[PDB]
């Protein structure tokens, strides 16, 4: 149920990220959704050991489902790109990206 909801958001996230391949807004939206994916699923500790945490995955996805206004810090590997952005905004961007692929 809530599991069904999470699963559906997972489908969308998987489909939109790392595909093959116009305007500059698209470039930023693609990067933001990739950094979001990394925030949820690729957390590491100091010294870069993988931090596996099912509760973290559930919590992030639950906040995405609820379009939480909570803001999160998304950073590129090289620390050059930094977004401070709400789950609400990420949710809207995800749904739009998925929708545009269906066209």
């Amino acid at each position: 149920l809530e599991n069904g909801r999470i699963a559906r958001l997972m489908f969308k996230l998987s489909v939109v990220n790392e595909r093959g391949d116009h305007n500059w807004s698209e470039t930023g939206e693609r990067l933001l959704l990739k950094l979001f994916r990394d925030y949820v699923f690729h957390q590491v500790d100091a010294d870069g050991k993988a931090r596996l945490d099912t509760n973290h995955y559930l919590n992030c996805l639950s906040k995405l489902d609820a379009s939480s206004e909570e803001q999160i810090l998304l950073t590129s590997r090289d620390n050059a790109t930094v977004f401070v952005v709400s789950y609400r905004s990420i949710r809207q961007m995800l749904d739009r990206a998925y929708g545009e692929l269906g066209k």
Partner: protein, 324 residues
């Protein structure tokens, strides 16, 4: 003149941007800086179009993102509205929320070498964009679309709306443009060949510049004064003498007849336009040559970027606020 009391003037923060570990470091120092009018932000651009934002007097990093393809070159200018930040590059205009969330992207064929933009007669709903090219474009900021294309005989390095659109050409003249029709109301000969900086209030224009652009015979030399124009009565005023050579200028947002004048060594004069005899003098300690300058909406924050990639914020040690 009168020196500044250190209890009123000190270095409050500093950041390297782009720093050595930034992808644009190789391309040079900051291309422009500007105080936001909300959220205590200072924005800094790179020579390849990265925008970085920093919070408060200590310049705590906030957000950072590239606003056009890096082959487009420098981030030329910022503008600020309630919904987000507008970014200008030579080939495009970009708007994003301060979060970095994209709002719109305009990459019009007539955008060949844009250099400047300003608001117009419509508050923050519309901008004029121009540059070293013979077309100008009018953009609806709400819809994120070009609504008009205009011919221009003069090419522009700066645009700013106050009472009128004050338009600095790349030849050192200032055109005063009707903000509704964009027709030239008056042309003012400010400097001989170039304008390095322009600011304006509803009552004044002030510029920095020089008599010749750079050649292998002659470096571009700045003038020992700020040029001043009376916007209320549409006539030139006496220049403000500035022996250290005037590189940048901003009108003080609270002291309405006062200009803030900066030389390349970071020497600053706060000078009343109506009588220059009383001006406060202070010094900053830039590592390199000062390249850019801005003042916050409250007047309390002064920012300076140098050619060694540093941006500094100076002001009073007593709890300063950039806006509100």
């Amino acid at each position: 003149p009168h020196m500044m009391d250190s209890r009123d003037w000190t270095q409050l923060g500093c950041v390297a941007y782009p720093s050595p570990i930034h992808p644009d470091y190789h391309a040079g120092p900051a291309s422009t800086i500007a105080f936001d009018n909300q959220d205590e932000l200072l924005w800094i651009g790179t020579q390849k179009g990265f925008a970085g934002s920093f919070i408060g007097r200590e310049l705590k990093r906030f957000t950072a993102f590239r606003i056009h393809p890096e082959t487009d070159g420098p981030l030329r200018q910022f503008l600020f509205v309630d919904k987000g930040v507008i970014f200008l590059g030579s080939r495009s205009v970009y708007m994003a929320a301060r979060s970095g969330v994209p709002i719109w992207s305009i990459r019009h064929e007539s955008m060949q070498d844009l250099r400047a933009m300003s608001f117009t007669s419509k508050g923050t709903s519309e901008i004029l964009v121009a540059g070293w090219q013979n077309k100008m474009l009018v953009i609806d900021v709400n819809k994120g679309e070009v609504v008009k294309e205009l011919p221009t005989q003069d090419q522009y390095s700066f645009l700013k709306m106050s009472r009128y659109i004050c338009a600095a050409t790349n030849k050192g003249t200032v055109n005063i443009l009707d903000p509704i029709t964009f027709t030239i109301k008056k042309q003012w000969q400010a400097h001989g060949a170039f304008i390095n900086d322009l600011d304006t209030s509803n009552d004044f224009i002030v510029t920095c510049g020089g008599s010749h652009r750079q050649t292998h015979n002659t470096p571009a030399i700045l003038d020992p004064y700020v040029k001043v124009f009376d916007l209320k009565n549409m006539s030139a005023m006496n220049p403000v003498p500035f022996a250290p050579l005037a590189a940048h200028v901003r009108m003080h947002p609270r002291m309405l007849t006062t200009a803030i004048v900066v030389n390349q060594a970071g020497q600053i004069h706060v000078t009343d336009l109506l009588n220059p005899s009383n001006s406060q003098v202070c010094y900053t300690q830039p590592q390199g040559v000062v390249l850019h300058f801005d003042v916050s909406r409250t007047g309390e924050g002064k920012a300076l970027a140098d050619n060694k990639h540093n941006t500094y914020v100076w002001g009073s040690p007593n709890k300063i606020q950039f806006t509100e």
